[PDB]
Amino acid sequence: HHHHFNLPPGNYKKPKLLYCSNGGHFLRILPDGTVDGTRDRSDQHIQLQLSAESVGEVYIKSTETGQYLAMDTDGLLYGSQTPNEECLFLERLEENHYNTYISKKHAEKNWFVGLKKNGSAKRGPRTHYGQKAILFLPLPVS
Numbered sequence: 001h002h003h004h005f006n007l008p009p010g011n012y013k014k015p016k017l018l019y020c021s022n023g024g025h026f027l028r029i030l031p032d033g034t035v036d037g038t039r040d041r042s043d044q045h046i047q048l049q050l051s052a053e054s055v056g057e058v059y060i061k062s063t064e065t066g067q068y069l070a071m072d073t074d075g076l077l078y079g080s081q082t083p084n085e086e087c088l089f090l091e092r093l094e095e096n097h098y099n100t101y102i103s104k105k106h107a108e109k110n111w112f113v114g115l116k117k118n119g120s121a122k123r124g125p126r127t128h129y130g131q132k133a134i135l136f137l138p139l140p141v142s
Helices: none
Strands: 017-020 025-029 035-038 048-052 057-062 068-071 077-080 089-094 098-103 136-139
Touching: 035 077
Parallel strands: none
Antiparallel strands: 017 025, 017 136, 025 035, 048 057, 057 068, 057 089, 068 077, 089 098, 098 136
16 A cells, blocks of 8 residues: 555445535535635535445445546546546544545555645645645545
8 A cells, every 4th residue: 555544434325525624625526526715614525434345445436426436547536427447535533533535546656636725626636644734634524
């Protein structure tokens, strides 16, 4: 593995908002497949159903559209209609508190799901350990 295995608590029973404290955005998978953050708690596209593949591996699915969060070969987040290798993330605890999501496909490159302060998604290679953009808190929903 090229990553630790501190796992966050809690479970996948209910959908979550993935709140990025960096700019205070909820991770959003828009119907057109683009991914960004919004501060709008009422947004219909921020409700995410996570599910485990292996322990510590998750899919992150829009409950509204069914799209899976994915990170493509060039590090861009997108919404995938179907689950593929780009859709698996290594969900970890970080700073003893947050959840981070590393692209499993690109795990060796330490490509994370991250949101910038303006709510734009980080491109995988622009992420790294230690960043704020990568730190999410899973909140309740709808």
